[PDB]
Each structure stands twice: as C-alpha cells, then as structure tokens.
Amino acid sequence: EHQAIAKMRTMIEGFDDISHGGLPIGRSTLVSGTSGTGKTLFSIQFLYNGIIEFDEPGVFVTFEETPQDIIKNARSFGWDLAKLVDEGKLFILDASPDPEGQEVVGGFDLSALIERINYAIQKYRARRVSIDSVTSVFQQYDASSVVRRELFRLVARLKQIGATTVMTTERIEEYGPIARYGVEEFVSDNVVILRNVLEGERRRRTLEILKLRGTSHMKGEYPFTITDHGINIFPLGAMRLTQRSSNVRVSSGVVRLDEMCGGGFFKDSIILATGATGTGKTLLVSRFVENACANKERAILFAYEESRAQLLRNAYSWGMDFEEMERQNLLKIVCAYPESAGLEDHLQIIKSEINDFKPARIAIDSLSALARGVSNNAFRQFVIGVTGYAKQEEITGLFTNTSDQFMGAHSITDSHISTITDTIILLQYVEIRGEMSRAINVFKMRGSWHDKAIREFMISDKGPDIKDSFRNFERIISGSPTRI
Amino acid sequence: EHQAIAKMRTMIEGFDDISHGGLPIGRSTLVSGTSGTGKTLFSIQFLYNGIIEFDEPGVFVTFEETPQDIIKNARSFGWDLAKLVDEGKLFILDASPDPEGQEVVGGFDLSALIERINYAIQKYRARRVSIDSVTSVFQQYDASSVVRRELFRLVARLKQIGATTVMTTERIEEYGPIARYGVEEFVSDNVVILRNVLEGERRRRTLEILKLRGTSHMKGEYPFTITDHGINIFPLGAMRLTQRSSNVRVSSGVVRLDEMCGGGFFKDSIILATGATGTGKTLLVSRFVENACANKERAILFAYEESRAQLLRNAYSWGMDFEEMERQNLLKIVCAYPESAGLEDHLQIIKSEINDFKPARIAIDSLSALARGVSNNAFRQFVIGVTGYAKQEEITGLFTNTSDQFMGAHSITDSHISTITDTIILLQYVEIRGEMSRAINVFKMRGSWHDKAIREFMISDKGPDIKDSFRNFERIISGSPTRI
Amino acid sequence: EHQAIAKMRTMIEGFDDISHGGLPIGRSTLVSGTSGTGKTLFSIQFLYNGIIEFDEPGVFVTFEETPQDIIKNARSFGWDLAKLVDEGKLFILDASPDPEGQEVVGGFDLSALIERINYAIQKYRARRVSIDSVTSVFQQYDASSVVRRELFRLVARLKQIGATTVMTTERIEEYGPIARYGVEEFVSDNVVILRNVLEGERRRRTLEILKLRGTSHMKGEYPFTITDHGINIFPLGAMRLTQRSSNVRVSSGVVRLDEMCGGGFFKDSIILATGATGTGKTLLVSRFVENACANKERAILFAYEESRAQLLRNAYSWGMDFEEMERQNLLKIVCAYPESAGLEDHLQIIKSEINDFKPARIAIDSLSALARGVSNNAFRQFVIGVTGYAKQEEITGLFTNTSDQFMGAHSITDSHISTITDTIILLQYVEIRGEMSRAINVFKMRGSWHDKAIREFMISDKGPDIKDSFRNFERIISGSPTRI
C-alpha cells in the first residue's frame, strides 16, 4: 500500500500497548527466550485470541510437542483447542519427527513444509500462523550460514503467502545472544525477547520488543506474569498521568485527624503513614478500614506483616470488630508474606483483588515490608504501579511505611516515595521525662490546609486520642526534646 | 482426558508444595545439577516413596553406578532397596558398560534400551521410572544435534508407554547452561535444577522448578538439605500468613517486666530483646526459660554464643539452677557456633529439635550471631522461617539481638527485624555520674498496653531488679543524659 | 573550514556536528550495530536527504530486505521512495537471494556486484551509495581472511568510481568487537558505531564516530532517538557556552519574592527551587506559570509528579485558575512519569514541545523526579541539556528539586546541580513551638543583590504569604532552632 504498516491485535493483555497496535501484518515476528519463558504460550494465545476475537482462522506448526499435548496443556488456561480444531478455526500441523527418525531433511521439508503450511493456510483460510521452535528443525547438524538461508527462505515464502506469523526460538543465556545461532535476529523483521531473569533466588519474567521494521513500539523490558489467563503484561511505563481529581473528602476513622487534615482525606488521594515500629501505623490503617464499612463501603486491607488472626485480635483490642466487617462483605483482608512472590505478582494480585471486590478504600500495611530484598528501582516501579492504579480507579488508598530508625529519622521514607504521595501522616516517638510518648503530624496535604502542629497522642482500648502539641519544647523532631 | 494436568506426589518433603502437586503424570521431568547436588537421591527417593506410599512399582535405569552401589548407598537413608527388589516392587535396570567392550554402538542401544525398559515396565507394572545420568550415555562422541534426537526419541517412547519419568542430567556450571548439551532443556516437558552454590566457602543447596508445561508451580530457587531422611526442602515463600493468635498471657520470668508488658507476654507472640553487649539479654533469656520449667513446661534454649558449661555457671550465679531444669526433662539446651553450618541447616536443626521435644517456649540467644557473614536477605529469610514456625506452632518465642553499637544506636535492629516481631524489649546503657547504669524498656506490644517508662535496672545474684525511670533526665535514649 | 578532507552533509540532525561536516567524500563509512540499532534507517536517510536537499541521485544496495519492504518501511518516516525511484533520483539494487537458491556465490558476485553497482551509479549519475548488510553476503561460509579481501575490493572500487558510500554491518555484543569478523574496522576509512544499550531494563541508543581517516570529529558516544522524523542526535558536548544575557527582569508571580530577588527574576536565567516535600515548590511553579499568562505570554509546565487533574484541583485551591490559562492558549501543561522513557526521550520531548509552542517561560516540576534510577552523570547531562537549551533560547526557566531529607539537609541538591543554576530559592521546615512552619530564602542570585533574610511564610487559599525572619533564633537551618 501507500501508507505505513498495519498491525494485527494479539489481544494479549498489555502487548498491543507495548507494540503500538500489535504485530505487523503480513510479516513474521521472532519470539525467543530461554526454556520455560513462555514462547509457546505466546504463540498459542496469539492464535486463540485471533480466533475468539476476530474469527481469524489459525495454523499452528509444531516441531517437538505433540498435537495432543498442545491441546492438553492449553487446558491449563481454560483454552479448548480440540473444539476449535473441529470447528475448523484452528489447524495444528504436526511437523514433529517420529520415534523412528531418518537422516538429511533440510530441503525436502522446507518446501514441503511450506506446501503443507500453504495448503493448510488456504484450506482453512488461515490469517494467523505460529511456528513453535523453528530452532529444533535445523538443530540436526547445521552452521550459522545454513541457518540464515533456511530462515530467510521460510520468512520469505510466508511473506509471499501474506501470513502474519509468530516464530519461536530458544536461547541459552538470559542476556547473551538473542537466539541460538546469532543469525535469526537479523533475518526477522520483528523480534521479541521473553526473559526469565533469576537474580537473588527469585525469577522475573520480562518481555521486550527489540525491533519492528517500519513502525514504533515501546522500548525496554516489561514485566509480565503467566496466570490461569495466560500472559499478562504491565506496561508500567505506559500508564498516563491523567488521573481524575476531586475536592470530595472522606474520613480517616479518627475525627481529630480529619480536623488536622482540614476536613478529612480527599477521596482522590494517596495517603502515607510513616513512623518507627510501635508508633501505630497499623492502628490508623484499621481505623481507616472500619470507617469505610461504617459508611457501608467496601475496603481491602493488604497485610504483609501480621497474620489474619492477629490483625483481628489487635483490632478487637482497639475496639472495632473486624469479624462483622467481613460477614457484612464490606471488608476483605488478604495477608501474605512479601517473600511469597515477586513484586510483579503482588502487583497483579492486588489488582485482581480490587476488580473482584470493587473497593472504595484500600490500605497496604507496610510498603516497607514489600521493599525487603528487592532493588529500589524495582520497588519504586511497584509503588508507582499500585499508586497510579488506585488514583485512576477513584480508590482512596492508605499506605504504611516503617522507617528503619526510631527517633532521629532525617528522611520520611528510606525508599524515597513521599514524592509520589498526596498526603503524608508522620508518627514519631518523643522521649519525655524518661518516657516513650507518641506524636502525630500531618506533614503535608496537597489540596487542603491541614494542621501544622506536632500533637502527642496516646493509644488505649478505645483507640487513638490526639491531644496537644509540645509548645514548650525544642528539637522534638529528633525524638529527644529539650524542655524549656 | 479433557482436563488440566494431573500430578503424582513425590512425597519428598517440600517438593509437592513447590510443584503444586508433584510431577506431571505420564511425562518426563529433567533434573540436572552439578556433581554431588543430589540428582540420584531425588530420582531414587522418587521411586522409593512411590513404592512405600502408593505401592506403585518402579524401574530405575542406571548407566554408571552399579546396582549393588545404588542399594548400598540408599542404606545411608535407611532405604532397603534390596528388599523391594525381591518383593518385585523395584527393578534396577543395569545399563552400565563393562571394563571391556567395542565401539560404533550409537543409537543402537538407544533403541534396544527403549525396549529393555518397556519390558521391565510391563513386567513389574511400573508407574514410575527414573533414568540416572542419561547424559553419560551419549557421552561417547556426540554433538548437540545428535543428543536432541536421542532424547526426544526416549522421552517420546516413555510418554507413549505412559510412564511418569525423572531424568538425571549433569551440568558443569552452577549458573551456566541448564544441561551439558544445552539441548535437553527444550526437549523435556519439565525442568528441575539442583544447585550447590558455593559463595564464601559455604555451600548452599537450592532446587528450582524452571518449567512445567501445562501447569503452575512456585518460581525461583528454594533451599533444601540432604539428611539421613533424604532431600528436605523449605518453601519459605509458601508459608501462609494464617497463624493462630490468642489473648492468653505468660510470664517473662521477671514479675516487674510482666507488669510493664501489661500482664506479661502473650502465649502466641514473638519477643525481641535488643541491646549492646552486657546489657543483659542473656539474663532475660535464662529467666524466661526457667519460668517455663517452674510451670512444668518444656522449653529449648538455642545458644549461639556461650558454651553449655558457661551458661550453667552464669545462670547459677544469677540463682536459677539449670542443672535441675535438665534432669526434670523440662529444659533443653542446644549450643553450636553459627559457623558450624548454613542458615538452612540451622533452621532445620531448630525445627527437628522442636519436634522431638514439644517445646512450649523457645529462646534463641543472639539472632545477631546467626547473622554473621550471611547476607541480610538470606538472614531475613531465616528469621521469617524460625519466626513463623514458632507462631503457627503456638510456641512463645524470645529472640536476642546485640546491636553493633553501645549507646547512640538509632535503630532497634541493624538487620531490620523489628517489623517481624510482636514484642520489643530494649536494654540500654546510661552514663550517669561517671558510671554505666542500665535501663529496660518495653518498646512495643501489639496486643497489650505496656509501660512507656525507661526504667533503670541493676543485676545481682538474685537476678534483674527493675527500678524507676530517670524522670529528671534528658536525652536518655542517646545514652549520655543531661539532668534538668 | 580548516579540515583537510572535503565532507558531504548527511542532513541527519546532529550527525554533521559530530562528524565535523559530514561524511568524507569519495570514501566509505562503516556503520555497524546490533539488531535494531538504526543502521538501515541511517543509510536510507543518508540517500534520502541527499536527493531532497542536494538533488544528488542515490543507489541503495540491499542484500536481505526486499525493495518493496524498504519502500514500505520508509513510509514510517513519511518518505516516499517509490516517488523518487520513478523520478529516477533513487535506485534500489536488489541483491538479496531468492527463496529457492543453491550454494556458493559470494565471490564472483563480489565482481558481478561491483560491475552491477558501477552500472547503476553511471546510469543514474549517483553520488551517494549505501550498501545494507554486506555482512550477510559472505555470511555464506567464510573466514576473517576471505572477508577482508572482499571488503577491501568493494571499498577500493567504490573509491575509484568516486562514490561516497555508507556500508552497514552487524555486531552481536554492544561493547565487544566492532563488527562480526573483527576485520571490517580496519578496512573502512571511517567507522560509525550505533549502540542500543540495555542497562536497567531501559534502552539507550547512542551513536559514536570511532574514526575518520584525515579529519577530526567528536569523540565518544552520543545519545540519539529514532522518531517519525528519523534519527535525531544530541551533541550535548557540542553545545557552546555563548548564551545571551540581559538585565531584563520578570516577575515570579509572588510580589514579595520579587522584592527579595532585588526586583524579580532575570529573563535570561535559570531558577532553582529546593526544599523537602510539602515546602511549596509546586506552589511557586504554579504562580510562576500563572504570571506569564497574566501578561499574555506562553509558558509550559512539565509536570512529572502530579496528574493533569490534580495540578488543576490544587492550583484552583490556591486561587489561580489553570482552566482559563489553557483555553486562552497561554499555558500548556504536559505531565508524564519519568519511568515512561529515558532521559534522552524526555529531553527531546521537552525541546519539541518548546518549538511547537514558542514559550517565554518554562517550569519543570521536580528534576529530582527525573533523577530516579538514572545515573548522576546521565542526569547532569540531561540538566545541562534542558538548562542550556532554555538559556540560548531566551526562555526563563524555573526548575524544582525535592531534597531527600526534610530539615538538616546539608547540601542544596543531592544531585549537585546548584552550580549550574543562576538563582536558587530555598524552602524549608522550621520546628517552632511544637509546630512545622515554613521558611523561604533567596540563597543566591548571580546578577542581583537579593535579600539575605530567611523569611517564614504561610500558605493559604490566596497563596504564599512571605512574612518576617526569625531574628531571635539560632540554628534555623538545622530545622529545630533554639529561642535565644
């Protein structure tokens, strides 16, 4: 034609955003990665979605896995390929060798394969094709040069036929060559790399579109998860800074607090409660959750430090009954160790939990707990993640942070997140007359006025009682004042 | 079968949790690792458990080790294979070569064997098969391409036969290619990697399920141990945050302390005593252990700093007789240098000791001692392990931590564990009138009210005596006060 | 121009500065890089600009891509090669193989090709020539020695013919050998290296001119971007320190401040507002923006911390209506997460936005936000870029910086930029009588006198109210003064 290059949607959540529209039509896209990275999954999900969303028949060529297996495994995702094969929407072209192999097959098969592929494409009027592990084919006894021709031929013919293809290749080093022979990269018009990077006993799955001749696309790596719903990608760098903002207020669960905040938290806001352990962030979180049920609104409490049972014991001891909250189906407590998964997973679990429960308020007790081990950049990326998702979702969110040092803390957050949050509430110990007292302070509020006083507060069975400031002291921020 | 993948339990402690059920039935699982990582052990324990737990016969194909040795070695774990061979539950298919022979017998036996195995499978109605070191077979004179076909043939046949197999492979690099020919990886349906990572003159075994076609599993590495009971794996990231919590109280061994904690320690809770050396953590431990015996309850003292004898001397000088505690079989002292083993091993020894003595209380003298050398992340992982186990086991736990700096310490723990503990007891030196006095402080209690005063205390032959706070002082916490 | 070598301009933005004039005429320039680095784009742009700007006919030799694809792909940048091929200004020489082929040809073809290209050059009176992926030609079965001869031959003949050529080559490692056979480097007269470096999940493209036999050029790597307009390079080290300076003043949007600045900011100046979160930098920015519109002048607010909505809600809460600002087409708000792209991209986006809007004032809210993750050296390079552009463009700029620690901060900027800025405005918290008050201070002004007082200021619906200094206080900068 006389325009750019049209793309075909893969409907693979996230991918079409990363690829600025999907795969280039009429061309083949190389998808490689190490063992267990999700190559096959991608190739099948590409066909399946093609069928289920646009009724575009697909041909699936397999060189190693058996057709039965391919259909067997797809069930893992509630994928019924066998049905689609019947309806003639999907055709699995078995190209795998037989238990009784034979020599030299690097030419007959090439033209014969295309004949068959072409045959099938024509027979079912296939629009999408995906070849799984073309690597394995010439993995018979070939050199880079021989590999480059065969690929060139394969790609070329498929091009002529006008098939939008997905080719799967295997790697051996997470960051070494892009594909086995170090040739495939240059022969393909489009290249996608699926990575399963180790790093600290944890595994992180990323996807990168290295290149797409003819168009633009997002660059770099993007984390993704393989679930019961297949590949799920999060273009954390694609989320737009177009969050909705209003002047509507909401209570904290603490009236005096609400006063200090100039009338309560904003509905469209992210609040952060920082302080040493014991200061009472976990309390403010409970009082925040309860206030959402007292107004018959649903709230989720993602706890990463205390057990489900403990949260209940301590909550009851502060009055507020969490038991009822759950029965009335207004409050949902999750709970899970940060070590039970990687940030990417957690991010997703938080999201899905939000979708299946339509929360009005969300509270994550201790982001500081989720920052364990993980790198700072990976962490900030997570924070921006859960933070922005909440903002664009009209969900008020309260996040907890435990500073590494009680008293003397010179920075609000060790991880440096305060800049991403709308309202900051700071809890701190104050040594007074040989005793450890607390103090609460509305450090900042973007749209409101808020109290500038550093009020001391006690904790009882009733909960939190915000009293007066220490007007007669100096160096209070430090934790060890000087009475005057 | 139009359903998800079905797995078969290995009964190898921890494995079925990581593999979300066990090995996928009728499929082969590759298990590779470097020399001495426990490949053989895995494959055998796989068959054994099969025979002993579900009476599923098993065929074990060995290419290098002799059947006599395979039986001889198994005795190391109290495995009598010889017996199972007679009972015809287990059949060892000797495929090893002899001191003499010929050559040019490539795929010759690869085909003959696929029969010899099919034979024994039918003959003993085998359900589980394990081939040890298939690698060594084509370690005769082959290339990556020749190896891919032979494997694919073998796997394929075994799959037709419907047997659930485990294939052993060797590697040369702990983090390099998955298997010798970097081809096996893609040929197997399932990949398990056993690593024996060095790092700092210490060895650390970890197992990882790289992929499982068709199902889910836990990602990343997981520490494990090889004991007299075989492979023991700890899915530290699989432990759920569903610990039981009660309001029952227990004594610290110090009445005045119990008062400050507003009625004593909670049965279901983890207590942390922090302070510079000499502050007296070891004392509070002794007193906490004695109190459990005074109530005829079993308690264990894991000491990592003082000898068995020294603990006695110092305990006796504080009154409390540890001699009697042991005779009455109410108190159990362990003692071992953190350097005598890796965290994984320690964690396990702690667990087993708890199982063989049903403790009601537990005290680990110096967590900070176990933190020597080890990485902060490997440590936190150990803490969560011991911490959680105790919690879900209704065992009250007291842990000791020596801060790196006496006086001035701006953070409770250098390792940052305060966030994982329920009750925090802080001991600190206070310079008053040219003398080093002490002070005790209940820094926090999640369920109780506890005293906020920083009470000075002395140590005598009677033990700890908690006096009054320094109401007329400033900057106490700092260590160097200033009287008003 | 004092350079011994006559050069030809590429008209590729930035390249001619880097190459000190363009590509040496009558010589060949090797352009190598990994897959997807922009080799083809470079060579095509080279011919294109040649035809459009100088009516210099061009010959494009392709060994892998198809003439249709090369034309199809160029539409991505709005270039119509097809039209140029008709007019006879561009000739694409198809040298790619056919999907039927044989074996053996990379030699006489080297002579057949030479004679071919000489035909095209003579037929079209070509002046520019670019051979895309010569690498792939002897990628048939050759050794380093055979390659060196063939290249040298090709190059040599092209030189005789008098053609200025661009030869593309592929590399596998981003910093390893220059080209595949590690032989091309020395055979070519000039060598250009296109890199696409990973590093932290982001991709950074750089261009480097390694050598140019005969003349000088800019040494090292230079960041560039591929856009709808092709390759765009920023010779950040080529920016001359010859910015225009005037004594003209402009308001800051706050009258009291202007007084403090001895009559307002300088038109030709870069201002820096630093302080901990909550201090009000974002407020001053708003007021700085609003003031340019109040005087019917265009201004751009690049926000990297708050959404477009939030900025509006908060702005309105401080009076000043941002809604109207936009309608009147006097104020333009951008908004974007720093993680949504690398510095290079950001820098370019800021520049374009400036050209398509002719701003008089610009405000980047939080440079410290664009400093997330990125290396300090990469950051400073970014700051020098935006800062310099602004300066030479008579555009007044207000940049924001949040300090990692509230109160006690010993340095103006953690990134150490203060030395690059002309005027510095410092905001800070002052603990006074158990309360958090703010203090504003004109730390420095290069051309003015400015007030040296550290005035406290309050924030209201009306905005910022600058009051008086704390004359009766000591240790103000500390954050917790002493009343004397």
Ligand SMILES: Nc1ncnc2c1ncn2[C@@H]1O[C@H](COP(=O)(O)OP(=O)(O)OP(=O)(O)O)[C@@H](O)[C@H]1O
């Ligand atoms: N329902 C599921 N939920 C979560 N993970 C799953 C699920 N099903 C499969 N997986 C995971 O997805 C991976 C499957 O990878 P896939 O078969 O798509 O291709 P590959 O690993 O790229 O290449 P190969 O053909 O060599 O396996 C496995 O590693 C497995 O752990």
Ligand SMILES: Nc1ncnc2c1ncn2[C@@H]1O[C@H](COP(=O)(O)OP(=O)(O)OP(=O)(O)O)[C@@H](O)[C@H]1O
């Ligand atoms: N019934 C109670 N009466 C008085 N104080 C209580 C009561 N229960 C808990 N507390 C106090 O509250 C503190 C614990 O607070 P909380 O659970 O809110 O979370 P946190 O300090 O933010 O985080 P962390 O989990 O590290 O403790 C204890 O230090 C204790 O003094």
Ligand SMILES: Nc1ncnc2c1ncn2[C@@H]1O[C@H](COP(=O)(O)OP(=O)(O)OP(=O)(O)O)[C@@H](O)[C@H]1O
């Ligand atoms: N009772 C035991 N207690 C603790 N460790 C043991 C015991 N018995 C054996 N081991 C250890 O287990 C390992 C045995 O490894 P195994 O024979 O299972 O297979 P492998 O090392 O994976 O492969 P290979 O056949 O090359 O040895 C040894 O390294 C040894 O130190």
Ligand SMILES: Nc1ncnc2c1ncn2[C@@H]1O[C@H](COP(=O)(O)OP(=O)(O)OP(=O)(O)O)[C@@H](O)[C@H]1O
């Ligand atoms: N008979 C005693 N009379 C008075 N004080 C004693 C007596 N025995 C020990 N102490 C005191 O107790 C301190 C040692 O305390 P302890 O054994 O409790 O452990 P710790 O300080 O927690 O840890 P560490 O092993 O680093 O010393 C000494 O510094 C000393 O002052």
Ligand SMILES: Nc1ncnc2c1ncn2[C@@H]1O[C@H](COP(=O)(O)OP(=O)(O)OP(=O)(O)O)[C@@H](O)[C@H]1O
């Ligand atoms: N309009 C556009 N805007 C932004 N990027 C684009 C645009 N068009 C193409 N690109 C990018 O430019 C790159 C094209 O690279 P190009 O075809 O120039 O040569 P190459 O990658 O050096 O070599 P090869 O022939 O192996 O691909 C792709 O990586 C693609 O993402």
Ligand SMILES: Nc1ncnc2c1ncn2[C@@H]1O[C@H](COP(=O)(O)OP(=O)(O)OP(=O)(O)O)[C@@H](O)[C@H]1O
């Ligand atoms: N209507 C208002 N009345 C009184 N004070 C207000 C009002 N709106 C905002 N504020 C105050 O201004 C502060 C927020 O300031 P601002 O938006 O200027 O940016 P910042 O502190 O420089 O940077 P950031 O808050 O984005 O980290 C709040 O802490 C609050 O005290």
